[PDB]
Amino acid sequence: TVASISSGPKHTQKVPILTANETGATMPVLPSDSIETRTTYMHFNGSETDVECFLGRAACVHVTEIQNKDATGIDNHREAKLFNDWKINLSSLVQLRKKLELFTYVRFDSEYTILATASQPDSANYSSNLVVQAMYVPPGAPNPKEWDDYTWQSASNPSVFFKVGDTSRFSVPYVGLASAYNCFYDGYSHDDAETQYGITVLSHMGSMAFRIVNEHDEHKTLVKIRVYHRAKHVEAWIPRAPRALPYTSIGRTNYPKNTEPVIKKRKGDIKSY
């Protein structure tokens, strides 16, 4: 492939460099339209800018935490982090978010990796290997109430059991209801006067719930869960302007008030170098 062809002096009536940008086109002008060039080859394919590659590496999408401790006398397991959940979503952590929102609709399979590490803040003894249970709780399923409810039987709901310190990995097909996931949605769930506006209405993909299977030892053990997400088989439509201001909320476009100028002011003139 040639990156530049050889081109010499020109004295024409045919001027490729004068255009009318009002038309909305970006005319494909090249170095050889306005200087004299020599042949050179590309030596490159643009492999690593493919959208599959761009969205295809694992990104941290969520960090939560649960603890193993005596539940005796706990009136609210959920509240003691005896188990915890996560209202699945991919917009909470914002590094991966800016990348996805370069597109309007996106379609992909997900590969999740879950790393779980333990911490023993209060001076301790022997730690017996804890086994985490991650179970997917889709919309309209008995949400779990204690850390050892019938829910955890999970007879119809996919769940994975792995050890703290290890990693769990599995992959979920594209579960969207439509043909693509909306990265943006300028609509409502119905024409009410006070119903929420955004995608949050569109993206209720249910929550994921974690717990330790082990009963309690004499000390307490903090287990912190990190969920990583990798898009595989990516398809993206309609590019948009990149995010300039900071994010404030999952699912709304809102930016913070009295934010700071995002364009760097010159130290000098327009004329400055």
Binding site: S179, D186, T195, R252, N254, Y255
Partner: protein
């Protein structure tokens, strides 16, 4: 003697002529078309009013003055009250449509000024409150009036800050969306053909707007000496290939 410059668009029972055009943009290089069976889901036969809905509606005019910040209309909202297009809209459960948008602004060879005319698929607005305040329905359904970016923040309304496109992105990059400029010195109209763009084959016309049309002054209007300091901008829009499905009782929407 054909110029890129003169054009005629006849759609239904209405025709537009421009003698000072700058080509026309067809979003994503695709022209509006009906919904193919292979893509269909709802089993209902759809209704295609054709020429009674696919004609040109001219919205009320705006006034560009030296202080203007820009205006924003949403589709199909802007047309919610135009003739039979609008009736069909409130009466069917689902509908689908593409449009021809023609924005008009003429001046003289002594004026200067340049407007950006852009179509943004799925333009989800931001609340000026920050945090996770929502933007109430009425605020994103201004109707033919559209939203005036130089109007004041209101409560439950969107933010109207132009350098941020009403969503946290910079004005400068709106050029990645199908758009055309109106530069008084060149141009006097802008025309964009919009194919139907959605993640579902057909949708509700009232709970979801699928494009915002935005006209934004970028190089300020400058009139000749002792000229009146303003020009009107007119927007005429025509639904094209419209289909309605799931007819019934007639939606009632807030406000």
């Amino acid at each position: 003697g054909y110029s890129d410059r003169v054009q005629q668009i006849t759609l239904g029972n209405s025709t537009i002529t421009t003698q000072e055009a700058a080509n026309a943009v067809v979003c994503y290089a695709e022209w509006p078309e009906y919904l193919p069976d292979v893509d269909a889901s709802d089993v209902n036969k759809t209704s295609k009013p054709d020429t009674s809905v696919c004609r040109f509606y001219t919205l009320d005019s705006k006034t560009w003055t030296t202080g203007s910040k820009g205006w924003c209309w949403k589709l199909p909202d802007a047309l919610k009250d135009m003739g039979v297009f609008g009736q069909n809209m409130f009466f069917h459960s689902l509908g689908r449509s593409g449009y021809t948008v023609h924005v008009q602004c003429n001046a003289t060879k002594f004026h200067s000024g340049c407007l950006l005319v852009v179509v943004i698929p799925e333009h989800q607005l931001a609340s000026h409150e920050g945090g996770n305040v929502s933007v109430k329905y009425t605020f994103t359904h201004p109707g033919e009036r559209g939203i005036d970016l130089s109007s004041a923040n209101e409560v439950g309304g969107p933010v109207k800050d132009v350098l941020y496109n009403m969503n946290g992105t910079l004005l400068g990059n709106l050029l990645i969306f199908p758009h055309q400029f109106i530069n008084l010195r060149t141009n006097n109209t802008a025309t964009i053909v919009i194919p139907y763009i959605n993640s579902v084959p057909i949708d509700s016309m009232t709970r979801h707007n699928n494009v915002s049309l935005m006209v934004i002054p970028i190089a300020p209007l400058t009139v000749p000496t002792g000229a009146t300091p303003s020009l009107p901008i007119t927007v005429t829009i025509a639904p094209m290939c419209t289909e309605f499905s799931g007819i019934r009782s007639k939606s009632i929407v807030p406000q």
